[PDB]
Structure 1
Amino acid sequence: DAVFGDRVRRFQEFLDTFTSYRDSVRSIQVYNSNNANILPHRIIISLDDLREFDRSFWSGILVEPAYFIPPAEKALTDLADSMDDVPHPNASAVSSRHPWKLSFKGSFGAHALSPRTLTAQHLNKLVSVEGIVTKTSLVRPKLIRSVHYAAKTGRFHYRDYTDATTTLTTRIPTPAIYPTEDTEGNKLTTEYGYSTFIDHQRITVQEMPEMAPAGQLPRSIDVILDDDLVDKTKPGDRVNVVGVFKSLGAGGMNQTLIGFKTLILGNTVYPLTDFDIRNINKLSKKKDIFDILSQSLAPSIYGHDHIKKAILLMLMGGVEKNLENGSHLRGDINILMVGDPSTAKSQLLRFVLNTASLAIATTGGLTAAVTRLEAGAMVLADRGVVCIDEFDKMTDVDRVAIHEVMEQQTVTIAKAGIHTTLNARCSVIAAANPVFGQYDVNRDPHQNIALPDSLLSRFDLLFVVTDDINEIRDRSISEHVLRTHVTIPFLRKYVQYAKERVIPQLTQEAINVIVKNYTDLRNDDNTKKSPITARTLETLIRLATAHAKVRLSKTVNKVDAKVAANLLRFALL
């Protein structure tokens, strides 16, 4: 059709008026010329630039991708093959075959959607979907164009294969058995090495449980990956995918529940205010900043200030250290709580899930078991904080396997066959109750909880909390409940700002105090909640770094070590 050429010209005009895209192509060509690895034939186009230049073409792509994108594909391919000479004869006949793909970015407006917000009214349109990748399939190539050669004639004839799973518009069904004879009847020769192939993979993007509504079945979408972006995300990755939400097959129109197979032809993959900054920084200048953020951790829960302080430090976290030797160092802080019930053990454990940017609340499966191997509860915890209740209920396998996660922050699969290493950069907080119904302060926590010292001591801070029979505790603990008969969103922004925009580093002045106190701890023979080892020295570094996160400073000062040492003694005495 004639209108197709006009739409092609608009993209050519779009490329002309925005030199950034075409000069980037020229830079890519120069890079390929210097290597004459080869970069793929894909560039990214901003939708905002297209909208500001031609709304109808921009709207046409979103509403009718099959009728507006292929004109852009032809325009880009024609410009690429004509911007330079492509001098090499043999290489030009093969390297220039690949059509130049397009990728999209920018604001999507009404089409910025989720697997649940996406509906059938948006089908056969271009949409952007944000979700979590659940599983993927093996990459396999797609046949695009074949080349035929007759021995008796010595000349080449080419044939194309297209299908609706990769073609934007529904073309006449091409696929068939490979031909054997040409027009003249001469036997043809199958030139495997001159056929063009494109890799293909399907992924299953799902709505996150973090945002799913309660009591409703999930929504998920199938996404097709092609060519160069065929492998960009692993299962569990939070991804943003732009593609043509399109139907397949038939809903029983030919030859009952069978519906049209709606899925997205993915063409782009992206893995996932100033006033808030002017507020977070401003409020930190007062002398009592740290106590403010400790009170706002479940304010209705009375007491337990130090554990709230420890939880906040765990949320801020330390800095994992890497070296040119390839070493990795622990930077996460783990806390375990023990004692008699009815002391808000699970209340604060529940509160952490309500405060962290990402958190997983489960109970004592933890590791990947067997095939893709399912991602265990501790496996899915990367870059998050873990809330486990009934921590005593761990089985023998869980108790012996949690050691690697606790210290190395890594999950190692060593099952029969596949071996792999999975990131487990997670801070673990847990609570437990005595087996014998009541806690005995006359005996150590190892003799009460029945978890081995080799497991209990791995937690940096072990809190033993017991409600005394003293009346003054009973008065306050009951009055605070009866009294019920800086904002939390700001606090969560503060944690988001601190964990990303500031990375504190050590200083010899802090070392002067940290090493001194550890030396005193090793020298002090008085009984304590845990025997002092080198782990406490690492804990002090993490705690001081965690406090530096609160102060929003790239360096470390004396007060950071003073607070870290003081709190550590509290958990030990």
Structure 2
Amino acid sequence: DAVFGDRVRRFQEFLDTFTSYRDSVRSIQVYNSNNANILPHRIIISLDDLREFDRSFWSGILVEPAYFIPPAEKALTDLADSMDDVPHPNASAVSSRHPWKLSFKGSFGAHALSPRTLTAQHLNKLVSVEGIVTKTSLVRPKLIRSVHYAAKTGRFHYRDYTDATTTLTTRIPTPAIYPTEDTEGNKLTTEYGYSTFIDHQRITVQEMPEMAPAGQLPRSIDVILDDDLVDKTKPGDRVNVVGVFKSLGAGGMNQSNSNTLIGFKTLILGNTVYPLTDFDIRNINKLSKKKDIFDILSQSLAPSIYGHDHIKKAILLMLMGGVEKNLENGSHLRGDINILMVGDPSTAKSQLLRFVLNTASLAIATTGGLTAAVTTDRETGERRLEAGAMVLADRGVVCIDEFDKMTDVDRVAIHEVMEQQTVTIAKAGIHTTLNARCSVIAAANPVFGQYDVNRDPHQNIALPDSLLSRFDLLFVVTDDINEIRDRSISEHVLRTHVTIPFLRKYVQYAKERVIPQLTQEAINVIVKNYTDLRNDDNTKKSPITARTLETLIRLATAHAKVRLSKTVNKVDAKVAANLLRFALL
């Protein structure tokens, strides 16, 4: 109709009045011509610019996409096809026939929704949905335009097709298969090389648990993606997706089918996918030179816990971490540090773990699929692996609660994670190796509930010694009551009846830019302390092995990172030795 052409010309005027779009289109065209990889035929439209250009057209796109978006697509495709002559001898007949797709950015107005807030009132509108990608379907190509040759007539033919998903407006569907005869009735010669196909995939978006109330099942909605968006995401991705929420089929309206339970099927036609200072650095570097900066940073950690300075120091050093190395023989050296907590259950382990999980930027909570060696199947039957916490926490930290309750399979899997920082997957038809370079912090509790302070955790918790030896530091806490100190710490609870934003930047910068190496200063200290510990036959929390020396080196490197020094010094080794002696007592 004439309105379609009017809106096509209106979108052409929009494109011309802001040359910042069609100049990017020209740059894409030039880049594609130079490569005779190809950039996609997609541009992003600012919703505010469209609002300030034509309020009616922008409101139509938001509220009545079926009558406004296809004109805009036609206008953009015409502008792209008319801006150059396409002098390609053969590519002009195939590659130039792909329509151009639109994307939107800016303020969405009231169309900022979640899979729970998304309701039937929002149907037939362009809306933006925030959620998590639970799973993705299998990718298949889809026929768009068929080209064929009529040998008997000596000239070619073509045919187009429509589908309820790709067509925003309800055009007449075309269920016809690839034609064998044309209007002239002569048998057709198939031209696959000049036919057009577009890939397609379906994904499911579910509301984030961060806002989900209890007592109800989670809300999910399906999104359709095509062409360049077909394989851009993976399951478990936080995503902000803009698309047209559209219904399909019929809810028993045909024949009688008067069942009350039957409802109409709905989904979203996705078109845009958004997967989810120097002053501070200089202040960090200046603060690093103060003698008390380490203690200040330790006291900033865990403000809800009184005392436990050594545990806070260990947490800070573990966050700082060591330095990995590579050798000419192909060997690799572990740098990260692990911490284990033991003692009575409710005593301060939960609070410290909560602080660590909330403070760290890449902290993942675990408790008794962490092995990342299990497959999840799609609706069509095919299956894909799902990521595990030990693998996702690469270059991060793992927080474990009720570590004693984990299974033996988890233990035998985490042995390699803690030792070689890798995971060796060996299953029926699936074999792969994944990096697991993650720091581990865990809490465990005795069976009796009350820790026997006279004995090691090897009898209080009875975990395997090989598993325990993979933790660089161990701490035991138990509520040994001193009435005045308990009163002082519990007055804050009774009242209920360095800033963290800067500290996180401090840790980030220190781990990002500082890579300390060893120095002759620490060599003699390490050798002497290790020899003394070996010579010390008195009872200790754990025997002295080379893993203790590795822990000493890692702690020295972490302390150097706290000092942001690229070369270790004697003070780092002394602090590491003092901390290790404290942990062993």
- Check whether TM > 0.5: yes
CA distance in 2, matches of 1:321, 1:266: 45
Q: Are the aligned partners of 1:357 and 1:496 in contact in 2 as well (CA < 8 Å)?
A: no
CA distance in 2, matches of 1:504, 1:207: 43
- Structure 1, 486-495 or 81-90: larger mean CA deviation: 486-495
Describe the SS at the equivalent of 1:193: strand
Could you tell me how far 1:266 is from its partner in structure 2? 1.6
CA distance in 2, matches of 1:504, 1:405: 24
Could you tell me how far 1:403 is from its partner in structure 2? 1.8
Could you tell me how far 1:335 is from its partner in structure 2? 1.5
Q: Describe the shift of the 1:30–1:489 C-alpha distance in structure 2 as closer, same or farther (beyond 3 A).
A: closer
Could you tell me how far 1:429 is from its partner in structure 2? 1.9
Q: Describe the shift of the 1:485–1:27 C-alpha distance in structure 2 as closer, same or farther (beyond 3 A).
A: closer
Could you tell me how far 1:99 is from its partner in structure 2? 0.9
Residue-by-residue CA offset, 1:27-55 (whole Å, 9 max, x unaligned): 33333333323333233334344444444
Give unpaired runs (5+ residues) of structure 1: none
Q: Describe the shift of the 1:61–1:536 C-alpha distance in structure 2 as closer, same or farther (beyond 3 A).
A: farther
Could you tell me how far 1:199 is from its partner in structure 2? 0.4
Q: Describe the shift of the 1:336–1:103 C-alpha distance in structure 2 as closer, same or farther (beyond 3 A).
A: same
- Structure 1, 319-328 or 160-169: larger mean CA deviation: 319-328
- Find the counterpart in structure 1 of residue 380 from structure 2: none
Q: Are the aligned partners of 1:548 and 1:554 in contact in 2 as well (CA < 8 Å)?
A: yes
Q: Please, what is the CA RMSD of the aligned residues?
A: 4.2
- Structure 1, 446-455 or 286-295: larger mean CA deviation: 286-295
CA distance in 2, matches of 1:156, 1:348: 74
CA distance in 2, matches of 1:512, 1:172: 84
- Structure 1, 413-422 or 70-79: larger mean CA deviation: 413-422
- Find the counterpart in structure 2 of residue 451 from structure 1: 463
- Structure 1, 187-196 or 542-551: larger mean CA deviation: 542-551
Q: Describe the shift of the 1:202–1:251 C-alpha distance in structure 2 as closer, same or farther (beyond 3 A).
A: same
Q: Describe the shift of the 1:367–1:13 C-alpha distance in structure 2 as closer, same or farther (beyond 3 A).
A: same
Q: Describe the shift of the 1:174–1:326 C-alpha distance in structure 2 as closer, same or farther (beyond 3 A).
A: farther
**Count of equivalent residues:** 572
CA distance in 2, matches of 1:308, 1:47: 49
Could you tell me how far 1:565 is from its partner in structure 2? 5.1
Counterpart among 381, 391, 397 of residue 385 in structure 1:
397
Q: Describe the shift of the 1:488–1:32 C-alpha distance in structure 2 as closer, same or farther (beyond 3 A).
A: closer
Could you tell me how far 1:172 is from its partner in structure 2? 1.1
CA distance in 2, matches of 1:221, 1:504: 49
- Structure 1, 253-262 or 180-189: larger mean CA deviation: 253-262
CA distance in 1, matches of 2:571, 2:351: 31
Q: Are the aligned partners of 1:302 and 1:480 in contact in 2 as well (CA < 8 Å)?
A: no
Describe the SS at the equivalent of 2:565: coil
Describe the SS at the equivalent of 2:327: coil
- Tell me the TM-score normalized by structure 2: 0.81
- Find the counterpart in structure 2 of residue 124 from structure 1: 124
Could you tell me how far 1:521 is from its partner in structure 2? 6.3
Residue-by-residue CA offset, 1:361-409 (whole Å, 9 max, x unaligned): 4422432454x34545545655664432221122221111112333444
Q: Describe the shift of the 1:387–1:187 C-alpha distance in structure 2 as closer, same or farther (beyond 3 A).
A: same
Residue-by-residue CA offset, 1:408-452 (whole Å, 9 max, x unaligned): 444443211123445545433211123465544444433443222
Q: Describe the shift of the 1:427–1:117 C-alpha distance in structure 2 as closer, same or farther (beyond 3 A).
A: farther
Describe the SS at the equivalent of 1:414: strand
Q: Describe the shift of the 1:304–1:32 C-alpha distance in structure 2 as closer, same or farther (beyond 3 A).
A: same
- Structure 1, 30-39 or 395-404: larger mean CA deviation: 30-39
Residue-by-residue CA offset, 1:547-573 (whole Å, 9 max, x unaligned): 677778999888766655543443234
Residue-by-residue CA offset, 1:483-507 (whole Å, 9 max, x unaligned): 7657777777877888789998999
CA distance in 2, matches of 1:203, 1:322: 41
Q: Describe the shift of the 1:58–1:485 C-alpha distance in structure 2 as closer, same or farther (beyond 3 A).
A: closer
- Tell me the TM-score normalized by structure 1: 0.83
Equivalent pairs: percent with the same residue?
A: 100
Describe the SS at the equivalent of 1:246: strand
- Find the counterpart in structure 2 of residue 399 from structure 1: 411
Counterpart among 430, 434, 444 of residue 422 in structure 1:
434
Q: Are the aligned partners of 1:244 and 1:264 in contact in 2 as well (CA < 8 Å)?
A: yes
Q: Describe the shift of the 1:477–1:14 C-alpha distance in structure 2 as closer, same or farther (beyond 3 A).
A: closer
Q: Describe the shift of the 1:437–1:528 C-alpha distance in structure 2 as closer, same or farther (beyond 3 A).
A: same
Q: Describe the shift of the 1:47–1:547 C-alpha distance in structure 2 as closer, same or farther (beyond 3 A).
A: farther
CA distance in 1, matches of 2:84, 2:72: 19
- Structure 1, 489-498 or 455-464: larger mean CA deviation: 489-498
CA distance in 1, matches of 2:147, 2:339: 65
- Structure 1, 224-233 or 326-335: larger mean CA deviation: 326-335
Q: Describe the shift of the 1:116–1:406 C-alpha distance in structure 2 as closer, same or farther (beyond 3 A).
A: farther
Describe the SS at the equivalent of 2:268: strand
Q: Describe the shift of the 1:393–1:268 C-alpha distance in structure 2 as closer, same or farther (beyond 3 A).
A: same
Matched, 1:361 2:373: no
Could you tell me how far 1:257 is from its partner in structure 2? 3.0
Give unpaired runs (5+ residues) of structure 2: 375-383
